[PDB]
Structures are given as C-alpha cells and as structure tokens.
Amino acid sequence: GAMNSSNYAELFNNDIKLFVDDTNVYRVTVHKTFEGNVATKAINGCIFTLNPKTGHLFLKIIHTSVWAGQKRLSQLAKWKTAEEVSALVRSLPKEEQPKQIIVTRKAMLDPLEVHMLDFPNIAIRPTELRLPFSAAMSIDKLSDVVMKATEPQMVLFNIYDDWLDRISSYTAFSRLTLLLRALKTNEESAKMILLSDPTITIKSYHLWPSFTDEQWITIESQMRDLILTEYGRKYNV
C-alpha cells in the first residue's frame, strides 16, 4: 500500500523500484497581457524518474511543443507523465522493469495505473512521505539541460555521482533528500553552502561537488542547520 516511515527501508532491498515525481512536468510563467488580462507562458519541464537504490535517474524532458493546442493542461500533464513512464518501462528489458512504482503525488495513481494495464504485476503505489523532488530543478545541470532542449529528449543521470563507492544506498538517499530539502527551503543559501569553496569542483560527469568524506560531514551539518533556521523563521519559533 502507501509508503511511509514504517516501510521506509524497503526502498533499499533488491526489488527494483522507481519514484516518479511529476511536479516539474508542466511549468508556466505568469504575466500580464497588453489589455491587462492574465496569461501563462509554458517553459520546458521534466519527469523525474529515480531508482533510489542505484541512483539511476531517467529525466524525461517535456518540451513546450507537447502542450501546443491543448486544453486542461495541468490535467494532461498527469496523463503525459504516465504515458512516458510507461514507454520507459516498455523500453527496458524485462529483468530491469520495476516491480513497483511509487508516485510522489496521489493524483498520478489513476493515470499511471491506466497506462500500465499491460503490466499488472507492477504495483503502482502512493506515498505519505513528503519527498523534496520538486527541487530537482535547483540542480544546475538538471535545470540547464531541461532549459536548453529543443525536442522531447531523455537524459540519464546518476543522481548519486560516485557516492555508492563508499556509502550505502540508505545513506546516499538520505544525503540526496537532505540536499533537496535544503534547496527547496532556501535555494540561495543551500547553493551558497555547496559552492562557497572554489577549490572543490563538480566533475563534468557529476552533478554535485567532489567533497571528501570529512567535507560531506561539514556540508550535511550546514544543510541541517539551514533547514532548522528556516522553520523558526516560517513559524516564529
């Protein structure tokens, strides 16, 4: 059933599973028109499909052309997301196909379930956790590739860079959500913290900097402190 803090470590056993976050599929700007009415402009989006155990990220870029001449777009976005996750499952060899897909938002359940009818042994599940995958377009290289695309396009990443060479999935996945949590709450600060020291660089094939073990501790301490600071400010505590 639903995924929560009880059944949290299931994410890390050897059953293939994917998270599907659809918060950045349909992205608009809001502006005034010449007659003073309000209009939207769409920008490029991305389906955010992640294997929390291995770090494999399937970043489906949603080109603004997909929206052209369509109504009820925010509704269509859900169905387009379930279309593309399906095509992705079909594109993978059987032994790689997930046994479960966990949607970060309950409104994706019915579209995915419908589009996955050809895969009845693939359980579609909701979650009660509050994952921070909308902050994914705070990662400079994810946002750049999304922004620069000219057609629908798929882009593979490992969102853990090379961390699994030295830490477990559990820990990896905790670093990730910590970083995205921080970037969601106060992007400017989160990024300041990550990039302050110019001598620590991002490998061209990586997304985050090449911190040493000791530095990842200092970083994780500093992201924790950020997230606490912003909550007090949010509620006066």
Partner: protein
C-alpha cells in the same frame, strides 16, 4: 391473476411478495398469495423471526409454470417448488382459496410502482445471472457473492452479473487511455451496449435486478453492480437521449421505494454526487436529482 400456495407455515417468518410484506406467526394456518398480476416478474422472500440475518427469496414468473412454497425442516427454510400436475395444482389452489386462508396481492390500481421497478427485468436474463437451470425460478439471499467478488469462492452459488471495471483493458482502448477513462462512452456504447448487452433494455434490466437484490436481501455485491452500471452511464459524454430519460425514471422509482432508514449502506456517496453534480449527465436526471435532494439531503 395467479396464485402461489404454501403447504404450511411451521415457523414464524416475515414474508414478502414484491414490495409487500406480512407477518406470519408460528403454525398460523397460512396457505399462500393470490391475485398476483400476470405479466411481470415477481419475487417472494422471507426473513425468519429467529434469525434477522439472511433474508432470502425466489424470483419467478407464473407464465412459466405453477409454483408453490413448502418449508423444508432439514434445511430450515421455505423452498419454492414447481407442480407439474396441472390438475393437482388448481385443486389445492381452489380448496385453500375457498377456505380463504390466502392473502391477496394488495395492488392499488393507481400504483405503477412495481411495473416501474421491473419494466426491463426478464426471467430469461435472470436465470443466466442465477444459473440453476433445473428450476424455472431463481434463488437469492443476502450472503451470495458475485463473480467479480469471487475473482478479487463456490461458483454454483454465484451471481453472474456483467463485469464492469473502469481500469481494465476492456474499458480502455490502447492509445486512448486518457480519453476513455474520463469519457467512458466507448465502454458504454460499443463494448457494453452493442457488444455484451445488445440493447439498452437488457442493460436496464440487469441494473434494475441488481437494485432489487440489494433492497430485499441487502446483497452487498448487488449494490456494487447497480452503482457501477449507473456510474458507467453518468460518466459517459455521449448517451442515447432515450436512455437518459428512461434512467431518470428508473432511478427515481428506485430512490422512491428505498426504506428511509437504509440510505447509509445502500447509496454510495461518491457515485451519486458524481452522477448528479459532477458527471456529464448532471443536467439530465432532473427527476432523480429532485427526489434525492428532498429525501436524502444529508448524503449530499
């Protein structure tokens, strides 16, 4: 006018015929129901005073034989049975009616209620849903399960309703995923109407039969079928205008006949608010809408 005699009334039971019902006391000399209109289906049913669980009954039509009722003390319940000896049957009927030990089917002549609830119900469709083809009548009770429940155990005792599932390959054309799941017209018109049911009248009949099984026996799966056939129509943007207008009359009389105190288990909040206020067909159940709002405003 037809009759359904009873051999005897050994145990205290509440007896029902159609939407009518009587209390019969233990070994009261009771011997049957007379003046039953030929022309529709009927249902006779039972609730023992000792076990207010399991209501049970028989669906039938006098035009298909001469049926009577006898208690079976081994099985502890009243059984419907056919008499094949025509002469022998009219004989026991005339003797008991002369002895006047029979209640009369109490039909006020202004009342079209029974006809309105059974208009599309046919015995032959019924005996496909309750498969037991060594009897011309059909047995139902509170606990019997449907074929769709069985899938999600004993099949001889199954209600073989037509299986409707909005998230199935049947209901969803590949490539029209979004379209078909928001707008079920495909499923309704081609798959179900044209395909399985053949005409709107068989459909209405199953829907109508499922409602009554729910009302008389509290058959929870019958409730589920009835609601789903309603949802399929209401969640379709393209429905024959004759079917909308008939459905408004069908539902009106169902809602009108329902015991007031049972509204909570028998009406599914979601389906009805969808039909009457969210679906394509909101505007199209003026009669059903008006009666729901004045009788069960709380559910909404």
């Amino acid at each position: 006018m037809n009759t359904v005699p009873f051999t005897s009334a050994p145990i205290e039971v509440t007896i029902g015929i159609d939407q009518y019902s009587f209390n019969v006391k233990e070994n009261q000399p009771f011997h049957g129901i007379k003046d039953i209109p030929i022309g529709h289906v009927h249902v006779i049913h039972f609730q023992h005073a000792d076990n207010s669980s399991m209501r049970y009954g028989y669906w039938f039509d006098c035009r298909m034989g001469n049926f009577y009722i006898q208690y079976d003390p081994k099985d502890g319940l009243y059984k419907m049975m056919e008499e094949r000896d025509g002469a022998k049957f009219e004989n026991i009927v005339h003797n008991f009616k002369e002895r006047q030990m029979m209640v009369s089917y109490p039909k006020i002549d202004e009342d079209d209620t029974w006809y309105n609830l059974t208009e599309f119900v046919q015995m032959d469709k019924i005996r496909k849903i309750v498969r037991k083809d060594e009897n011309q009548f059909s047995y139902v009770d509170s606990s019997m399960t449907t074929v769709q429940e069985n899938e999600l155990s004993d099949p001889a005792h199954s209600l073989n309703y037509t299986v409707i599932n909005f998230k199935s390959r049947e209901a969803i054309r590949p490539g029209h995923e979004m379209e078909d799941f928001l707008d079920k017209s495909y499923y309704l018109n081609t798959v179900m109407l044209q395909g399985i049911f053949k005409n709107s009248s068989n459909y209405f009949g199953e829907l109508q039969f499922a409602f009554l099984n729910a009302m008389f026996f509290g058959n929870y799966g019958s409730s589920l079928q009835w609601h789903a056939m309603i949802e399929l129509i209401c969640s379709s943007a393209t429905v024959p205008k004759h079917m909308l207008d008939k459905l408004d009359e069908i539902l009106y009389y169902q809602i009108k006949t329902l015991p007031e105190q049972y509204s909570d288990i028998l009406l599914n909040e979601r389906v009805w608010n969808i039909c009457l206020y969210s679906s394509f067909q909101k505007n199209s159940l003026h009669n059903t809408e008006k009666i729901m709002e004045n009788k069960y405003p709380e559910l909404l």
